[PDB]
């Protein structure tokens, strides 16, 4: 895979190559892939390879990353949650 | 995403944002999502976003959390198991 | 399971028994299995057991391994990416 606008990756604290879950609001598809850095501020959300069978252009998706962390940090950790407009720009 | 009654989250030792597996007894759906804290004592089990395609109001579900732990602790660890009535109140 | 040519395993830094995700470009299947060492230089990509229902001889696949790593290393880590010809030989 999934190409993500570098701005959304920074906003969401995602690294190039970090495992990402894509869930499709339109068709209910759920898959696991990794993040590729897309042209900054382009609002690109690009489905590459096998995933294109399940997740289609125009679909509303949620992109999710998880982390393993010790009990103490888990209770205090604040996840980076990015809301976006119809043009994939943060709000 | 899954909105869970804060009472069930405390009973089950789940944090807001903790990864949760939902398995659907009615339709056999299985998905991975995270816990959102729901109104305490409301008995809410709310499916939010793409997951709503697979897991439906009225369905009987099992909610599961896993942990990564060193071999020694894994052999001794006791999971938190919450049984609930038809109104999602602990027993 | 998946039997992989020992040359591709070395090229991709995969061990026998290492967890592998197979994604199928032809049919959109996605599954998790482990690597078995195949005859070196044979170009074997063999689907063994239940996975054979989903991923078929002749299919184009991507084989993916993930690692858990501390935040610091995750930001700097360079994955091993292997491109292959139609005969499953590295380029």
């Amino acid at each position: 895979x999934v190409t993500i606008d570098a701005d959304l990756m920074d906003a969401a604290d995602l690294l190039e190559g970090e495992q990402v879950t894509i869930v499709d609001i339109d068709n209910g598809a759920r898959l696991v892939t990794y993040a590729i850095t897309g042209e900054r501020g382009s609002g690109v959300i690009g489905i590459n390879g096998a995933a294109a069978h399940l997740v289609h252009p125009g679909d509303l998706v949620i992109l999710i990353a998880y982390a393993t962390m010790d009990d103490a940090r888990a209770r205090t950790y604040q996840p980076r949650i990015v809301f976006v407009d119809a043009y994939n720009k943060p709000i | 995403x899954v909105t869970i009654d804060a009472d069930l989250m405390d009973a089950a030792d789940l944090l807001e944002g903790e990864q949760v597996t939902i398995v659907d007894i009615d339709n056999g759906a299985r998905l991975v999502t995270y816990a959102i804290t729901g109104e305490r004592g409301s008995g809410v089990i709310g499916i939010n976003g793409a997951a709503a395609h697979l897991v439906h109001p009225g369905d009987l579900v099992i909610l599961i959390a896993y942990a990564t732990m060193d071999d020694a602790r894994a052999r001794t660890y006791q999971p938190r198991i919450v049984f609930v009535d038809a109104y999602n109140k602990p027993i | 399971x998946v039997t992989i040519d020992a040359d591709l395993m070395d090229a991709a830094d995969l061990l026998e028994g290492e967890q592998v995700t197979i994604v199928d470009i032809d049919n959109g299947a996605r599954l998790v299995t482990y690597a078995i060492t195949g005859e070196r230089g044979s170009g074997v990509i063999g689907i063994n057991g239940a996975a054979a229902h989903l991923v078929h001889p002749g299919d184009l696949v991507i084989l993916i391994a993930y690692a858990t790593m501390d935040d610091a290393r995750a930001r700097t880590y360079q994955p091993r990416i292997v491109f292959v010809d139609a005969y499953n030989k590295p380029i």
Binding site: X1, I4, L8, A12, D13, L14, E18, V20, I25, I36, G43, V44, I45, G46, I47, N48, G49, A50, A51, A52, H53, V55, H56, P57, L60, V61, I62, L63, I64, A65, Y66, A67, T68, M69, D70, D71, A74, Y77, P79, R80, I81, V82, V84, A86, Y87, N88 | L15, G17, E18, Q19, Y34, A65, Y66, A67, T68, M69, R73, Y77 | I25, F83
Partner: peptide, 24 residues
């Protein structure tokens, strides 16, 4: 004991393109 926690979420993004035959 380590828990698996949400760290990143991009909420209701629109897929802009798809390529079955991507190379990269």
């Amino acid at each position: 004991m380590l828990r698996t926690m949400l760290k990143s979420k991009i909420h209701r993004a629109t897929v802009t393109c798809a390529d079955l035959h991507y190379v990269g």
